[PDB]
Amino acid sequence: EGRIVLVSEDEATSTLICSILTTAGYQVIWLVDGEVERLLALTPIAVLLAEPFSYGDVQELVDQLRQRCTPEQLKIFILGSKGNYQGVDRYIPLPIHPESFLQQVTMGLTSLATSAQ
Amino acid sequence: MAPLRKTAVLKLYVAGNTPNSVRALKTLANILEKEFKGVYALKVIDVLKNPQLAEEDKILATPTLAKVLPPPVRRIIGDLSNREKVLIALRLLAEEIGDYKDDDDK
């Protein structure tokens, strides 16, 4: 249960995020926005949305994920500005730091059954 | 465990409609998630959502697997629906990345 999906149009931020989480033992999959079915296909333990989104609405994706997956089974995190939306466990404001991002993700993982398997 | 942020990136070009393309992600993720987790990051682009991306990478067919790191970059075109071939292709890649030395010289 170490699969994390990151959705963002900006490849540079996504590349850094993917590399930092992978070396920590987690697997990050970068998916393009606008495709909920793709998100469902690779249903991770947590979904990372990094602003800004030009091909979709941030609230729309959050709402759609909530409708298909329960909050106890799938967690939603937003990287960018504000992040004060319902269905979001924690938000990560930019600019972000390597240690800061990892600590927030790790702490956010303390939910549901808090078990590796 | 000292090295960090050093991972390989695999790109998958697919179409969000065809079952063989939709399930391809599932077969690719399954093999990488268990056998090679924390080593390879996966990037997926939907050609039906942003057609110009495919044109930029000169890709007119899907599903297509593109190797970003480690370079030189490589292009893999074939049936990704079959887990057997996918595992075989990924296993070969694993051996290539595993055999890496820092300033071996000789």
DSSP string, A31-92: E-TT-HHHHHHT--SEEEEES--SSS-HHHHHHHHHHHS-TTT-EEEEEES----TT-SEEE
To 10 degrees, the CA torsion angle through B70, B94, A22, B2? Answer: -80
Measured at the CA of A44, the angle between CA B85 and CA B86, to 5 degrees, comes to 5
Q: Does B50 touch chain A (CB under 8 A)?
A: yes
Beta bridge partners of B65: B12, B76
Q: Using what technique was this structure determined?
A: NMR
Could you tell me if residue B71 is left (phi over 0), alpha (psi between -120 and 50 degrees) or otherwise beta?
Answer: beta
Distance between CA atoms of B18 and B101, rounded to whole angstroms? 42
Inter-chain contact A55–B50, Cβ cutoff 8 Å?
yes
Closest CA to A33 of A18, A17, A51: A51
Token pair for B73: 């970059």
Scanning the structure block, which residue is given the tokens 């110009």? B52
Distance between CA atoms of A23 and A18, rounded to whole angstroms? 9
Interface of A to B at Cβ within 8 Å reads: 2-3, 11, 14-16, 18-20, 22-32, 34-35, 37-38, 41-42, 55, 98
Inter-chain contact B7–A22, Cβ cutoff 8 Å?
yes
Token pair for B92: 């070969």
To 10 degrees, the CA torsion angle through A101, A102, A108, A112? Answer: 150
Distance between CA atoms of A83 and A88, rounded to whole angstroms? 8
B8-14 and A46-50 beta bridge pairing? unpaired
Inter-chain contact A27–B32, Cβ cutoff 8 Å?
yes
Phi first, then psi, for residue A116 (nearest 5°) are -65, -40
Q: Does B9 touch chain A (CB under 8 A)?
A: yes
Inter-chain contact B41–A27, Cβ cutoff 8 Å?
yes
| SS3 of residue B96 by DSSP | helix
Q: Does B7 touch chain A (CB under 8 A)?
A: yes
Closest CA to A42 of B48, B84, B23, B65: B23
Inter-chain contact B43–A30, Cβ cutoff 8 Å?
yes
| SS3 of residue B10 by DSSP | strand
Distance between CA atoms of B63 and B104, rounded to whole angstroms? 37
DSSP single-letter state for residue B65: E
Q: Where are the alpha helices (DSSP H) in chain B?
A: 19-34, 51-56, 83-98
Say if residues A76 and A88 touch (Cβ distance below 8 Å): yes
Q: Determine how many CB atoms are found less than 10 A away from the CB of residue A43.
A: 15
Say if residues A3 and A47 touch (Cβ distance below 8 Å): no
Distance between CA atoms of B23 and B16, rounded to whole angstroms? 10
Full set of structural domains in chain B with CATH: 1-106 (3.40.30.10)
| Amino acid at site B89 | A
The upper half-sphere exposure of residue B69, i.e. CA atoms within 13 Å in the direction of its Cβ, equals 14
User: Nearest residue on chain A to B30, judged by CA atoms?
Assistant: A42
Among B5, B16, B44, whose Cβ lies nearest the Cβ of A20?
B5
Phi first, then psi, for residue A37 (nearest 5°) are -60, -40
Inter-chain contact B41–A20, Cβ cutoff 8 Å?
no
| SS3 of residue B61 by DSSP | coil
Phi first, then psi, for residue A80 (nearest 5°) are 145, -125
Inter-chain contact A28–B41, Cβ cutoff 8 Å?
yes
Among A19, A31, A41, whose Cβ lies nearest the Cβ of B7?
A19
Distance between CA atoms of A15 and B88, rounded to whole angstroms? 26
